[PDB]
């Protein structure tokens, strides 16, 4: 049981604060885990650091496969969890989907990167360090991919307190492995970690609990999609302001920091909603998932107001840690005002997109997030941009376009529910 | 729809439209071959080239091949499905319209091109991509002619494509009525201009002739990742006879002309099966869609019984227009006699793997197509690791293709 009743008043949910704190406590760990070995990987030199920095940017692109493993074993658990249906065909068949996509990317995996690394801008001995560091890493990728999909198939129960806590211990496993092993050491840290957190899922599975294979792939199709394709669109977005020098270049960078700790709380949110909506979709209790997930909307809206509020009043206090150059300091400064009128709308955003993953839907975040960004994010800030001038058009759209979708895509759930009664 | 019927009135139009094409870069090759060697490179590494880009055409075919066949099954106005196809089609033109140019210098510089090779690509690529919303909406208008039944029209304007194409590049490369000489711009403007003709025709009998964009889009989408990816594929099972020197490289690409002079048939069936179980399935005649697909399927796999039987027994006879070391027509042989086996496979795959795209299944030869080429032809070759991964090819490109048939018994099963 997790679902809530048939519009039940219950004006205030807390059950969905409970259920998102610990999927917070997961991706704000996973910048401090990222941080920190970005600490170990400074002792050396800083041509390892863009070794490794390339690397986790590139190994963005890698995990975009990853998505089948997971959506294709978080929707249907949180579902069949909901019709109170035995959740085990799924978990055998989702844990070997994982393997079944992991061997691709195990032979020919470094070569995804080198192959690539030096078409964008590498050097001969910045890229011998990659090598170094992502070969321990291709090696144990069925490992990561189970791990994933552990993930995955815990939110479906609505029990991600085990995610949590396990992630609080793989990060010390990843913090005392680098530390102790520091360019190759850090690529140590992130294999031994994924055998760690997984093998407690192992051993988290003595006492825990093939026709579905298209199932599984044709929901989560999308999604590996929607992350692969999303990196180049992004991509896509930074070189506008690669145009602009290295000074708007690393204020935009300052810019994601600031908004990767203000976007956790949301991906918290999704993920949790992905579930809610799953468990009460799966039981037929319709009208209690919108009243659940129009609470989380109007709560996320909130949390998000108070998120790009202070956005706007500290701009300067954000950057000190950044605060370097003033012109640096300057568009950076402007960012975060822009950006900090468009927080309530990555509420609704995630949101309704996250929540219609869980439903099945996951289809419509793919048509969305992309059609919601060339011809919004990109053309109308580039196509018209010829003649501006300018970084704040591209920040100024974004804001402006993001709110489109995020608010103004509310209709696919306005609707999708509507012809579901 | 009980007997016998003449299935070949949807496949051999198509198959002439198939055909030609084969000559209309087969002279064009020519045409480039006039010149120096070096523009032939820029030639082939650009028409390769634009088999991965020609990717994005399936969105804007499969979105107007599907759902007017079975419109005009279920005796629906199919026009709707027609102007969002083609402004579906012109929009999809965009993002190759000034984006996707550079596209080519950025994958030419990574492959081992030259500084020369990619200025002829550029030289080349100039009109190409100028009327890329021009060939898109002659794309869009063959899956509609062809939705509809009528594969004799694109027929007849495959054959001006070809005259037009052939002529304006044979006058354009040297200049032949006191024109100057384009060079590799002329077989350029061959195909551009062998473009524009054709959609001036395609737009001037729809004087005479005859949203939910996002439906559309969910039906060509897995269709356009799977020639996208299987593109990829085949690069990766050449990179396995890479290995083995350039006579068995050379020996490879034989072969697939002589696949493609026989390749030509079952993908004119395809979308024969693919209109054929368009229109059916709309109408919810599913005892005729069913019997259908099963009399091309049979007549379908005995032609290729025969042709890949000739390819068994004359492999040397037809490998001389390319023999020239007969160590390369040593391995040129092996291949034919091997591919020459599984061909009244590809007949039952084209036919079916085509059918679920008519029944609206699309995500079915994605899932399929992929996990075939990669689990069973990639991996099992790679672990066995040139008539290795060629008769895990056969091997596999035969029976996974075939007993994935049930697929199709258990899609129709519980339809009825």
Redesign the interface.
Known sequence: IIVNPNEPYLSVIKKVVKLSIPIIVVNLLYTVENMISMILVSSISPSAVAATGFSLSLLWFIYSLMALSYSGTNILIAQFVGAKKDPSPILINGLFLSF?IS??LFFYGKDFVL?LMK?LGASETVRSLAKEYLTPIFWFIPIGFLTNTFYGAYNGAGDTKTPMKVAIIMNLTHIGTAYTLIVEGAGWGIAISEILAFFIYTFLLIFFKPKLL?KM??LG?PTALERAITTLSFNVFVGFLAKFGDKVLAAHQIGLRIESISFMIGFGVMIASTTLAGQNYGARNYRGMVHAVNTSAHFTALVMSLTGLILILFPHYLVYPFSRDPEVIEWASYYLQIVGISQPAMAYASIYSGALKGMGKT?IPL?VNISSF?LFRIIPSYFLLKVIHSPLVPWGFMTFETAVRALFYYTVFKKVVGKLL
């Open positions: 079944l061997l691709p192959f078409v298209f792939v044709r199709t289809h048509f060339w």
